[PDB]
Amino acid sequence: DVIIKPQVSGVIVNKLFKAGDKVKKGQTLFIIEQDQASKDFNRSKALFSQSAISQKEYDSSLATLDHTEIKAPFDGTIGDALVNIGDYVSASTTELVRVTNLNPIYADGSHHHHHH
Ligand SMILES: *[C@@H]1O[C@H](C)[C@@H](NC(C)=O)[C@H](O[C@H]2O[C@H](CO)[C@H](O[C@H]3O[C@H](CO)[C@H](O[C@H]4O[C@H](CO)[C@H](O[C@H]5O[C@H](CO)[C@H](O[C@H]6O[C@H](CO)[C@H](O)[C@H](O)[C@H]6NC(C)=O)[C@H](O)[C@H]5NC(C)=O)[C@H](O[C@@H]5O[C@H](CO)[C@@H](O)[C@H](O)[C@H]5O)[C@H]4NC(C)=O)[C@H](O)[C@H]3NC(C)=O)[C@H](O)[C@H]2NC(C)=O)[C@H]1NC(C)=O
Numbered sequence: 001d002v003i004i005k006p007q008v009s010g011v012i013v014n015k016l017f018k019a020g021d022k023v024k025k026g027q028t029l030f031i032i033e034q035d036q037a038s039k040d041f042n043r044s045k046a047l048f049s050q051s052a053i054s055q056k057e058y059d060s061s062l063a064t065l066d067h068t069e070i071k072a073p074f075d076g077t078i079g080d081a082l083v084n085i086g087d088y089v090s091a092s093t094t095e096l097v098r099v100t101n102l103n104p105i106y107a108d109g110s111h112h113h114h115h116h
Helices: none
Strands: 002-004 010-014 028-033 067-071 076-078 097-100
Touching: none
Parallel strands: none
Antiparallel strands: 002 097, 010 028, 028 067, 076 097
């Protein structure tokens, strides 16, 4: 009784899942690219340990258009795909795929919390 939803709004990049297969708590299934990979989540392709990329005038293409992998909420069963790759999608509202079986598990800690 749960539906797989992303964390942002952008465009599908890929799908590492199957129709009628099982899922895992934190298992990648979908992917969406957006102009916002959080300020404390994405680790970016690489870093600047030193003068290896010359950030002084390095390229910007290597630091943008990040991607957000959509991992299942909890192990169980996954249905089919509603949309396809290369198709723009909205925030969590996008119910491309849904998960069935198992109980509704939840235990994250990224951001957007009002429990203090
Ligand atoms: C997603 O993909 C992208 C493609 C990728 N980007 C690119 C371009 O490819 C993204 O990576 C980028 O973004 C991430 C995070 O979003 C990473 O950047 C973070 O980490 C960096 C270090 O590696 C930087 O942080 C450093 O600089 C800041 C200031 O801007 C902080 O330092 C300040 O504060 C300190 C403590 O308060 C010091 O100040 C104290 O000492 C002085 C000395 O006199 C004074 O007395 C002060 O008054 C003191 N403080 C107090 C309170 O009294 C420090 O000197 C000061 N700097 C300045 C200039 O003033 C930071 O340290 C943290 O600071 C906070 C509060 O400031 C403190 O609470 C923490 O304890 C402390 O850790 C510095 N850290 C280091 C290790 O040097 C970035 O600014 C930081 N981001 C943010 C939002 O803060 C990544 O490296 C980025 N890459 C590039 C190329 O830019 C990628 N990921 C994400 C998440 O987007």
